[PDB]
């Protein structure tokens, strides 16, 4: 692909074929001239070095390197280890409708309610705002609603207030220690730039209030909108599965 600087960049496979394709051509050119048999057997070495090098670089001997004096990424290292396609792009991934902040404590809440800041929650629900704009008809078209989202009419804060009521949200903290790694709250909107929690569930995460990064998630489908209510509301688990005494202990 052409790059942002106007140069190019290739993956490592697209020159290793240029080792195999070139050393293929040097063989078919050779056999119709019939060189003696100390040159011809040396040719069949390098294909077996090269059809190695398509399959694996760092296996059979000293690896085949590019200009950076570093080993070339083979086809085997596409599948091998934590760098491969398994643990970095197949099991865990990235996901959309996401965000993060510093965490802080607000004890004016109830148990199931958690904070959610304003100018985070404007991007985090942008498909919800467009649909409810086209349903009331205050927005004539989709592009007009994107034109009106910078106008910031007061009804936009009302339609967002309409849509965030009883729509649950997930709270996360990496790394997940056990089953209480993620819960589900109902949001309550404040005007700041930080996520507020309830103070009793800090011991469940083993998160202390000194600069973590807790992440949010928004369930899209109708079933998961029930599944937050049905399994992972903070009230529906006070029993930590390790041992049948409550994790909601005064800390």
């Amino acid at each position: 692909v052409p790059l942002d600087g106007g140069r190019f960049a290739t993956s490592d496979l697209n020159d290793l074929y240029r080792r195999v394709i070139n050393r293929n051509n040097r063989l078919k050119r050779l056999l119709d001239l019939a060189a003696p048999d100390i040159i011809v057997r040396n040719e069949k070495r390098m294909l077996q070095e090269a059809v190695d090098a398509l399959l694996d670089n760092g296996r059979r001997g000293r690896a085949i390197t590019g200009s950076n004096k570093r080993p070339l990424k083979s086809l085997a290292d596409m599948i091998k280890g934590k760098q491969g396609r398994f643990r970095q792009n197949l099991l865990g991934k990235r996901v959309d409708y996401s965000g993060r902040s510093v965490i802080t404590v607000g004890p004016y809440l109830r148990l199931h309610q958690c904070g959610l800041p304003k100018k985070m929650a404007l991007e985090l629900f942008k498909p919800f705002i467009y649909g409810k704009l086209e349903l009331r008809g205050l927005a004539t078209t989709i592009k007009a609603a994107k034109k009106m989202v910078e106008r910031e009419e007061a009804v936009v804060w009302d339609i967002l207030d309409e849509v965030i009521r009883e729509h649950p949200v997930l709270l996360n903290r990496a790394p997940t220690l056990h089953r209480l790694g993620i819960q589900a709250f109902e949001p309550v909107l404040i005007e700041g730039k930080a996520i507020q929690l309830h103070p009793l569930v800090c011991a469940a995460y083993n998160a202390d209030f000194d600069g973590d990064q807790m992440a949010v998630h928004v369930p899209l489908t109708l079933e998961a909108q029930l599944e937050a209510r049905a399994l992972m509301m903070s009230t529906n688990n006070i029993l930590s599965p390790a041992n049948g005494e409550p994790i909601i202990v005064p800390s």
């Binding site: 070495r45 070095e49 059979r60 001997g61 000293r62």
Partner: peptide
Amino acid sequence: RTTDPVRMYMR
């Protein structure tokens, strides 16, 4: 006990 093909050619 060598395996690198640089030495195998010059031998």
